[PDB]
Amino acid sequence: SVNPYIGRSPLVIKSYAEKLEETIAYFEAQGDELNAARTRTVQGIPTFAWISDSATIDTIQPLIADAVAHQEASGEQVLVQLVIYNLPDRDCAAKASDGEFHLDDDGANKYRAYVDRIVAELSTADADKLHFSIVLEPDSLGNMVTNMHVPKCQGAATAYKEGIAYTIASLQKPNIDLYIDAAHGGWLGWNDNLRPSAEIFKETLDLARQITPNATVRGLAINVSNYNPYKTRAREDYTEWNNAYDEWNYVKTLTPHLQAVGFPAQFIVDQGRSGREGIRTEWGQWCNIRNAGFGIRPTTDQAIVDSANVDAIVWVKPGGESDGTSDVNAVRFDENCRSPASHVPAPEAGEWFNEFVVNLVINANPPLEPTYAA
Template sequence: MRLPSLFTAASASLATASVLPRQDTSSYPTHDRGNPFIGKSYYVNPAYAEKLNTTLNSFLAKNDALNAARTRAALNVGTFVWVSNMASLPNIDAAIEGARAAKEATGKDQIVGLVLYDLPNRDCSAGESAGEFDLDKDGLNRYKTEFVDPYAAAVGAAEDVSFAIVLEPDSLGNAVTNSGIEFCNKSIPAYKEGIAYAIEKLQFEHVSLYIDAAHGGWLGWDGNLEPTAAVMAEVLSLAGPSAKIRGFSINVSNYNPYRSAYREAFTEWSNSWDESHYATSLSAHLTEKGLPAHFIVDQGRVALPGARAEWGEWCNVNPTGFGMRPTTKTGNRNVDSIVWIKPGGESDGACGMEGAPRAGEWFDEFAQMLVNNAQPCLEPVWPPSPLDEPEDA
């Protein structure tokens, strides 16, 4: 599930910026249910917190009390729950019960972030996160009946819980730039049909859907913006005339900053040189297609300035840190929320940093780096001192 090396193919010759029409985001009567994150707590995924405890213990073993305390802060950050194969479908029920327990304990409504990620022939241009369904083996039908249907049934039954669901990271970007790859060209029609089917099945009032729109380094080039909006409009149309989405997710599992004070050299010819600019660049084209120009932006990890020589570097980038914490105070009217979608510390694959494990496995050295380089810094959470403990009555 990674950025293909061909993302600049449609834009390498662009040396001047196009003039975009003025955006009008005043109303989306057929799509807009309001920002679903406002007034809610971001659900803290205990499974991810358990992995971070490994990193906390690593810092303690090195007598690094400060970074251990910073890791405790990360334990309390809301993160998305990934449902990326049939075996992980029970993660939905676990999140529902966890959100109910959190509301009971805190009195605060929760919003559960989920990722739906199991298309047939998944990751057609990279292959590090290939899925379990093969188009040549009835993969599209199996995706619908064995993955999407039970996914929708679990979510639909929990009417007392709010959900924000990201649909199929890094899939439709291939429809914009990578149809020249034979395997992608074969897979793209199934991507469109599969995502449309998921949209149709997830039409619940307590669910806000965000189709993944890759990131600014891939689709943010001027020549890719209109085709991206066209693909999104096609998919939503396939979902049926009454189908609704809230918007789009960007930068999922990537490393781009939301707002960068330092412009990297490889962004020179792009108006989408950070993710806030990408959201603004794409929004006008979405509006022209009648689509809702609302975004959530993954900042679960952000590359430090100078960490990458080119935008196409996607695997366990070093150095990287945890990014902005989840918030609806985004400074961009098109952006609903900053979120943490990719679980920081899970490897991108056996590539990038030396010693990296397979995709999805815990990479503790990388997680330690995220804590140490977090921007803004994580506020330390210190364990209670024995002197703070109440005396026995």
């Protein structure tokens, strides 16, 4: 197994880049050409494409066709980055989940068929020309470590392991690298959470190997949709007694446990919203955190990454797509989205939050280099 990111060009998601035209127009109207140009830079930064429901499977083949055309035109080794996010009884510790599959409505079998539909799209002649990096199931297995007092999590534990195992077993190809989601330092980095986390990742991989005999994964994805810095400048008070107080330290502290159980210790790390620290009063604040900045841009450069266990810094959650609505009356209202640290008003989850992106640009660290036309 080799670092699939080296020499590869992660795919710019066209549908995401187009959304940033609104942000460019805002800055232009402010007479702010530097930030308009920084936003153009952001348009050229690769992000992950999320497959968070069955309908979104329809976007995969057009994405692939575009990717192949780009590979032909550019001569790059295109690396398509995807998130698979649709377990049955998804998000078991949340008051509400938008996940479309439910265990009491044939959800386990429906999830397998959803995976099978993804497999078909990733098995075309065009798909074979590309390489894929796929994050498996954010907000899943950490619940088995810390949320087993929750009835829905108790009832979903076996299904989460079996579901992810099927996804792993179904996506063994030379041109696909898989990263199991492993939450973030503030969730699983606490001393007593490290070993059970490593064990559950290994347990899930072992289940996968009972389906497809020599099945492997590349490793883990961390900080997905969160804000934790890679290397903290000013270590925050809420991290007290947690040795995973930034994501680089999460890697360093989790790695020995992975090694002990025989699970691959290679990581990709989301930094898309990690540029600004001191934006939260509690580690568990996650929804549209105000003044978040774009973080370290996607890179494999070891001068920045500074760990043999880290394949790449990546941008998984696409900045500007809302984490949830702030409207108390909304059918999908989540009270976390009115936390004292949240940016309000915020639109429905997934909808474009332009004011938030304006701030992501302004608060980026390192500052964004502008892209000016020739």
